[PDB]
Nucleic acid binder design. Structure first.
Ligand SMILES: [Zn+2]
Lengths: 205, 180
RNA sequence: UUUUUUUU
RNA sequence: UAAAAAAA
């Protein structure tokens, strides 16, 4: 595993999405250190240049989580075959986001967002980035009560449920919780060129 | 309890520094890890009024209340390498406490480029304390551990990644050639 | 934080 | 007046 997964690895990602009928595509390249839990990614919009908040796309970028040596790294062992994951995000105002993704690095993403209110914080871009959220893990399932910061105060809550399935059966770990922090490092006025940074570290429950 | 800007203002130190000229001070970051009941303590010490952060942290460990029973693997990520005299004070304080094991990781090899501070830190890496300059993890460790990684971000998300890599690439080979 | 050398 | 690199 460590001989093929070097301490510095790059990836390429292709996403096709459709939000409220508006179709678009996104091409990206990134780089990071999988064993240290840091990664950066640069994205470019190729079609539809976006009428919605970019923050709903950031939580979709997981193979770069730092795992202790005595904890089996379930996601790293899935390579070179890769894995898949499917995510459903239900926002408190009726917005729904369904995402499917295959990772082989080459990432292929298919995204469908529907039922977002025209006056909601997503379509009106009243968000200020995601708060820190501890996702407890126990295929692999993950449920998040995510909170989106608002410009005028308060939070914009959403229920996220994601299933990660490796293409090759490996040893499953015990109970643990991953602390994750994502940051938008740079973006233009219309969010057509975005760079993202991610830190992730697992801990015992 | 540090600022994200202050992190790169004091830890990031290139061969040719930034646009303001020598606006740099010395910091220390002690991470005491009592493994008995897994009860860690952390702290930063600025280079205070004519008392180097090494002596300040020594007196802090002194007047905080030690427990002579168990051993402590204390890591210490400091911006500027300790000088000659405080290194000898450190090794004399470590010789009196056999239940202490210290690791020293510096960001820049700070010294007056004379002879005394050369062997002043060569005794550490050969007798009690493995002293090497920082790399990627110890910066990444000290980044979110000591410097507050809270809600705001003072436009330094990953700018260190290239500067940390330059500092590693240069000063780690420098410190290795010094230890050799 | 003070010196020496090469190149654009 | 900028900046890349190396030696003690
Ligand atoms: Zn000193």
């Amino acid at each position: 595993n460590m001989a093929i997964i070097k301490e510095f690895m790059r990836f390429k990602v292709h996403m096709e999405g459709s939000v409220n009928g508006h179709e678009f595509e996104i091409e990206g390249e990134g780089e990071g250190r999988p064993y240290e839990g840091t990664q950066t990614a640069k994205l470019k919009v190729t079609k539809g240049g976006l009428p919605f908040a970019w923050d709903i796309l950031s939580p979709q970028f997981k193979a770069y989580v730092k795992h202790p040596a005595d904890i089996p790294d379930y996601l790293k062992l899935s390579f070179p075959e890769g894995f898949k994951w499917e995510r459903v995000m239900n926002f408190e105002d009726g917005g729904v986001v369904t995402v499917t993704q295959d990772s082989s690095f080459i990432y292929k993403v298919k995204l469908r967002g529907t039922n977002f209110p025209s006056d909601g914080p997503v379509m009106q871009k009243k968000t200020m980035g995601w708060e820190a959220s501890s996702e407890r893990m126990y295929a692999l399932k993950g449920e998040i009560k995510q909170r989106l910061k608002l410009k005028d105060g308060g939070h914009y809550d959403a229920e996220v449920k994601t299933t990660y399935k490796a293409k090759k059966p490996v040893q499953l770990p015990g109970a643990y919780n991953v602390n994750i922090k994502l940051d938008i490092t740079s973006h233009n006025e219309d969010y057509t060129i975005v760079e993202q940074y991610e830190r992730a570290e697992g801990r015992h429950s | 309890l540090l600022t994200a800007e202050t992190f790169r203002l004091q830890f990031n130190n290139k061969r040719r520094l930034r646009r303001p000229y020598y606006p740099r001070k010395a910091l220390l970051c002690y991470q005491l890890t009592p493994q008995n009941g897994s009860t860690p303590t952390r702290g930063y010490f600025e280079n205070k009024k004519e008392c180097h952060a090494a002596i300040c942290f020594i007196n802090e460990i002194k007047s905080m209340g030690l427990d002579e029973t168990q051993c402590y693997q204390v890591t210490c990520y400091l911006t500027w390498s300790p000088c000659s005299s405080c290194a000898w004070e450190l090794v004399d304080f470590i010789k009196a406490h056999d239940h202490l094991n210290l690791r020293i990781f510096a960001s820049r090899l700070y010294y007056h480029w004379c002879k005394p501070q050369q062997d002043g830190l060569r005794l550490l890496c050969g007798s009690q304390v493995p002293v090497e300059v920082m790399g990627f993890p110890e910066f990444a460790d000290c980044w979110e551990n000591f410097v507050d990684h809270e809600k705001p971000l003072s436009f330094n998300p990953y700018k260190m990644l290239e500067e940390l890599d330059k500092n590693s690439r240069a000063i780690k080979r420098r410190l290795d050639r010094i230890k050799q």
